[PDB]
RNA sequence: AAUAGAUCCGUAACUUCGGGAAAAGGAUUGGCUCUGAGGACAUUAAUGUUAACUCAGAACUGAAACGGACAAGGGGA
RNA sequence: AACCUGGUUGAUCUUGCCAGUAGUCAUAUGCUUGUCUCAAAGAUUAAGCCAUGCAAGUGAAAGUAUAUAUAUAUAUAUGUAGAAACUGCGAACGGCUCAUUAAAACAGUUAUAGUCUACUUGACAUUUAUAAGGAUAACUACGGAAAAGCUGUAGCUAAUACUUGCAUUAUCCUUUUGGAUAAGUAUUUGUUAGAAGGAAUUAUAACAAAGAAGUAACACGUAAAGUGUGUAUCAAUCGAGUUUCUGACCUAUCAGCUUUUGAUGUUAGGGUAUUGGCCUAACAUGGCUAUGACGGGUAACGGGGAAUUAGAGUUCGAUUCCGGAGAGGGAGCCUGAGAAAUAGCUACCACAUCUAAGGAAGGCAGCAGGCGCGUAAAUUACCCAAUUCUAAAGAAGAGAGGUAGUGACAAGAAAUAACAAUGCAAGGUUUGUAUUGGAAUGGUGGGAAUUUAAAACCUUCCCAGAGUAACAAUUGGAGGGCAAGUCUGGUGCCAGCAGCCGCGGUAAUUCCAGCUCCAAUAGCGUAUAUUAAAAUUGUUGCAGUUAAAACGCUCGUAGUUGAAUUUCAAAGAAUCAUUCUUUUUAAAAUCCGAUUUUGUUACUUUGAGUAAAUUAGAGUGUUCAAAGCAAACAGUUAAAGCAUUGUGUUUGAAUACUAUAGCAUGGAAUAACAAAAUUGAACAAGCU
RNA sequence: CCGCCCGUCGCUCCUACCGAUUGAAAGAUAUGAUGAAUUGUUUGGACAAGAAAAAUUUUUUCUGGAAAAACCGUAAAUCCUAUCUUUUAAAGGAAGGAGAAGUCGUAACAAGGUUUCCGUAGGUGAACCUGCGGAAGGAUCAU
């Protein structure tokens, strides 16, 4: 038979996944979920080994079990579940919450949050969907049909969602003064207020982007993220704040110590 | 089913292997640092060779070049901190004209020699 | 059953490889006749169940004119585009020409407006001559292979005309 | 004794390039319901009088069998 | 390290090849082998045949539980479990091999506005009820044969297996509030209207007809209302099928191929999950081709990748991962979301087992192991501890996988000694050098620590354990290439050696030996293939008077190559004398003295998608290294940082590449294409 | 030059080629024929369940239906013809190459004693001879 395929070998996992050479063959192949298998990372690896939490598959399966670990205030069990871009993750005992975001390197890691911020949470619409009644709803990154959506919202534009009510309270457009973050670019990791959109006659569409260092760099419409306005970043950035150093000068600031 | 340790060879034969000036070019240096065979005194000429071909990329690229004082400094560190050469050096044609010699003194079998321990090389190794 | 083993478009052969697989398929043809309403159902991959037609007698038929829609019996069939023994053999198709009932549609017409929504469209003097008749024309439209029932619509017109001058210079 | 008429298909070695050749080797022809197509005569693009046997595919049929008698190569190395 | 040397001659310079040389993760094999790390391994030929044993199963809150066992107060209610069996999911994953495969597969790049999509996630639905009906295993009882992972009747029970079936909402009018109106989800047919996309016959709304599959007659128990299982639909998920544009080895002693047997296309229809000659009927004669079609061969799975490279290039790529194929050869089929499935079946062909002679069962190109073939390839071991998958999802499995054995396939580190003295040689009281005699180290033996699912290996501590450190290193040569012998003996054109030239008739520097030396050394030869050498395939970059080679000459098509010519130039700031930057200078539309676009392509600049491994490379002291992707920091045990008592912190796993094809993009030059007068324009007035 | 050397004919060995044998062998492509299995449809038709009558039995009716048959459809496997691909048996033939002091002759190398050579044609035991027309790579760069 030729079905789908239930294996991932090591070497073949996603680069940001970070898997050994020596650590095995097969990795954790992440089961169907919200999002996808290449741009997203599963429970496993991300309380094995992001969170050195764990030490071996057996142990970070007598985790899971105990209802101590929720997602968008929802508890699950699913060992290979996909985390998803950006959510809120929470471990109840500690009172602590992670935020997945990227990295300037371009990578996936957890970020500490308080409880009023994880309460808040983002999704970037995919596409509107109107049904039957002549009722709207928008489809996110997240894997999440959210209805009645405000009209005013556009198959660009973002929404705030309200993890616990399940409801969206503010729409973000994509205007000049749009802050977003690239997500699947050869560019990722970097936090940008937009420049410019570049429409193209019926392909992707590439739009340059600025800095705050006063640098443009150019990504297609489908890997960008409006995560704020102009004001600030609705999202407690990681440290390195999404401004991608040069690699010329992070050699002398990690020679300096 | 593959073992995914990389390996790979440290020492490439000479070729032409009966050149009498440079089979007493290299019996001379191996008693003036009293060493094993033949296989450490052409692994080290891989080494210095490797760096040397290296170095001599960034010198065809131009001045201001990104790549070039990138790995400017990427080798250049590494020169400093194995001690090739002092501080009066800074060039990358400085760092391209190094000698053979000069890359065994930092074996630790002479350095002991050099700083007491053993009043012969063939004492110290 | 599908896309291979066919001559290339330069006229050179193409040796097969790539041993049949299942996604093609290809099922046998359901040749649809008159009869008591028996079907059968086929299971198509992904668990979808397709209403094989083996035999039919009535549907749904559409006036366009009207806009509007009745169940109705077929009694005969008379012209496919398609070859002829398919007809002759009495089989149903999706552009095949059968003979509707005029009845139904009559009493439609002396309950919504009378006499011998969008009304008062004048109709058609011909398409009164063949309802006065009682044997009317009409066009099968629904697939019976796949759907499994013969709807269709009664032809008028222009389209009428050139079906029936094909049919009756003539013989 | 074995086909042997006709139509359609196909036809090797060799050759003096003309042949070999009807090479070899196949199919059809039965019976009927059919159908369709291919000349001379006249009116201000068309419609009327009047004389072929060549093809074709769908049927069904009849005791899966038919140049029905007569007449009519056996081929090949 | 962008390299050469011997061989044609009496002697010389050439062309020219042969030989030499080195690399191979490229195989075999000879000799030898004290250590450790690391680890290729039935691909080459027979995708040949297989004895044997294993390789897919699954129940921890939650389907069914009178086989049964046990505990709470008294035959009473709960339980805890539970063989068998029904039910559910998976077994379509994985592992192996590369036969076939030549616009096929693959790769990059597109679409699916032409489709399907299990588990999961998020939203959400339409036309007897204090809970309905049967149908049956296991099981009891009788056997059959030699038997199957075989089976008959009689009797019973269930379940989340199978089958029926128990409100209500929206809209219109006075206008919180009263009446009335209406009730089909996908799917299909006919008639209209019609938040986005790039284009809809889109979403959706209305009318007229059909219209399945449902909306729980099910099981467990969390807040000091919940969950599992299952159901209609939409979207992603994990994917899959079709699909655009580009790319391939040799062959013309393959030039015309395809078309009645679909060939090229239209119509119409069937069929598919969907488009499509996928198939059928009618109709038309089309379609590809020296820019190589159609054929043939490949000892051809393709790709990233490997060797070799100064750059070019040449050769290889069965084989870690991706895509394709197959499970002795074809073909067909059920099941299931997913198979034309092989440790599923059916039929034929070739083998082949049991056999009581009636009849049954088979596919190691899965893991060990055997036979056959061959130059050529491991143990019928241990374990799910490491990674990861299946399940009813913790304790069960997994010849997946790991560990271990053989293993001079390869790769990396590294023993077989140093030291004081005389005597000797050299030298102005310095180097080397047969004696004494003692320090130090391993290998080795053992015990231990540590280690591992278990054991061993590695490492660390303690005792024996080196003077001929008797604890002893070999391979190939000693004419030239090419280092090391006219040193000594045996033979004497024989024996032999010799990649090439050559040596061998008594003086053999080449044979056979001894001594010595030479090159490499736990490694070195031999054979074949391949790369550079080879500028001896030459685009870079060959040669053609005489070394090989200008067609006997001319015409001429394909091809290749092709006169010049269209917008110049000037002015200003900054380093060292220069260099560098900026501004404008006709005409047409745009803004009320000024705001600004003004052919196509090649080419060329930047970007976005550019799998990982591998490649070069960053950072990092596995004892260094092959490595690998880690680790570092104060801490005889506490200080600071911070939290309104304690809580470790800093980190790294980046970078370029992922064609030449495609998307966007700046663009003055160079190239082509069009526009340019057998007449073609622009403007203004008037006419329709 | 008492140099070099050519051919025929002798002997030995090796390789390839032609080869009758309707060659054979082996494979691989199209045709025709037979056609196992099997999807779908039609024809069935062991009953097992429902509707009727009498107070253990029967007729009729409506579905689900097992062996079995026919039809187009997919099509294994075998056979006819035609073609393509790979070895070899093959009696024998004709070569080539190599070894080898063999025989005969003087062919070329000097003006090689007949200048050499080409193409063509004929003869000859052989190298060779001859004619026709060319070339100097000639033995002549020159009344």
Redesign the interface.
């Known amino acids: 038979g030729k079905g789908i395929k239930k294996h991932l070998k090591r070497?073949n996992a996603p680069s940001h996944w970070m898997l050994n050479?020596?650590g095995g063959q097969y990795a954790p192949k992440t089961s169907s979920g919200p999002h996808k298998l290449l741009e997203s990372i599963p429970l496993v690896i991300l309380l094995r080994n992001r969170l050195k939490y764990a030490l071996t598959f057996d142990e970070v399966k007598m985790i899971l079990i105990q209802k101590i670990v929720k997602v968008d205030n929802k508890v699950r069990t699913d060992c290979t579940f996909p985390v998803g871009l950006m959510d809120v993750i929470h471990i109840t005992k500690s009172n602590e919450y992670f935020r997945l975001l990227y990295d300037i390197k371009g990578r996936f890691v957890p970020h500490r949050i308080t409880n009023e911020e994880s309460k808040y949470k983002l999704c970037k619409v995919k596409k509107i969907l109107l049904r039957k009644g002549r009722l709207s709803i928008a489809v996110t990154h997240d894997g999440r049909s959210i209805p009645y959506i405000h009209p005013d919202v556009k198959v660009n534009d973002t929404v705030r969602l309200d993890l616990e009510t399940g409801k969206v309270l503010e729409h973000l457009k994509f205007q000049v003064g749009s802050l977003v973050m690239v997500t699947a670019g050869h560019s990722v990791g970097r936090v940008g207020v937009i420049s410019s959109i570049d429409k193209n006659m019926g392909t992707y569409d590439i739009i340059h982007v600025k800095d705050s260092r006063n640098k443009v760099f150019a990504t297609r419409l489908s890997n960008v993220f409006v995560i704020g306005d102009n004001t600030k970043p609705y999202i407690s950035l990681p440290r390195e704040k999404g401004i991608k150093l040069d690699?010329?000068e992070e050699?002398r600031n990690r020679?300096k110590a | 089913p593959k073992s995914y340790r990389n390996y790979s060879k440290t020492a490439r034969n000479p070729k032409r292997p009966f050149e009498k000036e440079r089979l007493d070019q290299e019996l001379k240096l191996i008693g003036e640092y009293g060493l094993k065979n033949k296989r450490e005194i052409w692994r080290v000429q891989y080494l210095l060779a490797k760096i040397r071909s290296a170095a001599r990329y960034l010198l065809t690229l131009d001045e201001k070049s990104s790549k070039r004082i990138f790995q400017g400094e990427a080798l250049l560190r590494r020169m400093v901190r194995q001690g090739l050469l002092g501080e009066n050096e800074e060039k990358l044609d400085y760092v391209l004209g190094l000698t053979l010699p000069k890359l065994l003194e930092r074996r630790l079998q002479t350095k002991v020699f050099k700083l007491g321990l053993a009043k012969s090389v063939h004492h110290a190794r | 059953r599908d896309g291979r083993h066919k001559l290339r478009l330069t006229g050179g052969k193409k040796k097969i490889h790539k041993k049949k697989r299942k996604y093609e398929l290809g099922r046998p043809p359901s040749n649809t006749k008159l009869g008591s309403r028996q079907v059968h159902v086929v299971r198509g991959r992904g668990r979808n169940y397709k209403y094989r037609a083996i035999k039919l007698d009535s549907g749904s038929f559409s006036w366009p004119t009207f806009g509007i829609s009745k169940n109705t019996r077929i009694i005969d069939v008379v012209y496919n585009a398609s070859n002829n023994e398919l007809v002759r053999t009495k089989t149903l198709v999706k552009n095949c020409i059968v003979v509707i009932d005029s009845h139904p549609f009559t009493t439609w017409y002396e309950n919504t407006f009378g006499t011998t929504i969008g009304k008062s469209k004048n109709i058609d003097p011909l398409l009164l001559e063949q309802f006065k008749q009682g044997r009317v024309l009409a066009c099968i439209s629904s697939r019976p292979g796949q759907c499994g029932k013969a709807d269709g619509y009664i032809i008028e017109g222009d389209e009428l005309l050139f079906y029936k001058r094909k049919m009756d210079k003539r013989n």
Do not use: E, P
């Open positions: 070497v050479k020596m690699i010329i050699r020679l």
